[PDB]
Amino acid sequence: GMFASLIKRFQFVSVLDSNPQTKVMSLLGTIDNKDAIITAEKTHFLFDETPVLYNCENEYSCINGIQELKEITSNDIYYWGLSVIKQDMESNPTAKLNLIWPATPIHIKKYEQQNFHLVRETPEMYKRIVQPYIEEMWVNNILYEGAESERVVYKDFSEENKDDGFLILPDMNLDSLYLVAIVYRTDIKTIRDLRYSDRQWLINLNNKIRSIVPGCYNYAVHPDELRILVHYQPSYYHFNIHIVNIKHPGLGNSIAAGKAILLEDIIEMLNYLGPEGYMNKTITYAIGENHDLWKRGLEEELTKQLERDGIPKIPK
């Protein structure tokens, strides 16, 4: 058919994304010299037509379709291996497969996933490389011009909170609750600007978030079921706090050590860093290759750090 025929003509150019968490792979290519994107995703296991009430009686349900097993290794009560399972177009297909063609630049930009590098960012690196970049720098539309006011979940209005206040809105199933609190202060561009003197304010924000969010969802999510965190590097240089259901099943990098830092941890660390706060911290995090800071000095500094630590690397 049409679909099969188009897939057969697909000429591979490059891999856009490979995600071992979700078992998704996206490929850039061409069909009739026009750009094309194929996305493939492994199917989930099947259950008989909570998860604790599912069943495994039917032919293709659960692990019933195993044709072949092979051990990797074992130890005491733990055994693990690999399996081949019977596939079938109607009852147990192997993967979902989508095609975008002709694909536009916007589609390609959407599906390309960048590579990351662990950097160790010292105070001096921040001052020399990062700080000047931040200064050279839609949030304001939301804060001061009413943009997306229909979507806002909570907003401070009183004169007392003109500076220390904030608003909360969703990020663009209750398990997948994901909100962002954007503060009214304009002098905090990243966690680097948090001083010891800001600690009580952060504690107050943490307490407000947990006092308010549950009531917005009729106490269907509890205050202790919110993973409240910030990012470094953040996606935008105006301080903001991510509020995520602790059970959110969707997420990978956005909640990962190396990117996300718990608000409670920010708070606790400010007891020890002295007056200038996170200005004094050496922060190890994952920086993306597409980020402007990579070529502005982080790459060069990482190679020097590896040399100092006596770590083997491939040269430039």
Ligand X SMILES: C[n+]1cn([C@@H]2O[C@H](COP(=O)(O)OP(=O)(O)O)[C@@H](O)[C@H]2O)c2nc(N)[nH]c(=O)c21
**Which residues bind to ligand X, rule: CB under 6 A?**
75, 78, 138, 148, 169-172, 180, 231, 234-236, 240, 242, 254
- Least Cβ distance, residue 3 to a copy of itself (angstroms): 4
Could you tell which of ligand X, a copy of itself, Cl ion, none binds residue 106, using a CB distance below 5 to 8 A set by kind?
none
> Radius of gyration over alpha carbons of the chain, in Å?
24
| 65 vs 260, beta carbon nearer ligand X | 260
- Least Cβ distance, residue 242 to ligand X (angstroms): 6
| 22 vs 197, beta carbon nearer a copy of itself | 22
Question: Which pairing describes strands 283-288 and 116-121: parallel, antiparallel, or unpaired?
Answer: antiparallel
DSSP label of 136: H
Question: Do 302 and 294 touch, CB atoms closer than 8 A?
Answer: no
- φ/ψ (deg, to 5) at 130: -85, -50
Query: How many angstroms separate the CA atoms of 181 and 169, rounded?
Result: 7
Residues 272, 278, 282: CA angle, nearest 5 degrees: 90
Rounded to a whole number, what is the largest CA-CA distance in the chain? Answer: 69
| 103 vs 132, beta carbon nearer a copy of itself | 103
- Least Cβ distance, residue 219 to a copy of itself (angstroms): 5
Say whether residue 250 binds a copy of itself (CB under 8 A): yes
| 40 vs 64, beta carbon nearer ligand X | 40
Question: Do 84 and 67 touch, CB atoms closer than 8 A?
Answer: yes
Could you tell which of a copy of itself, Cl ion, ligand X, none binds residue 143, using a CB distance below 5 to 8 A set by kind?
none
Q: Which of 9, 32, 59, 81 binds a copy of itself (CB under 8 A)?
A: 81
- Of 90-149, binders to a copy of itself (CB under 8 A) are 93-103, 112-113, 115-120, 138, 141-142, 147-148
- Least Cβ distance, residue 156 to ligand X (angstroms): 17
Question: Do 167 and 154 touch, CB atoms closer than 8 A?
Answer: yes
User: Which tokens belong to 52?
Assistant: 């604790």
Q: Which of 199, 210, 238, 291 binds a copy of itself (CB under 8 A)?
A: 210
Query: How many angstroms separate the CA atoms of 64 and 57, rounded?
Result: 8
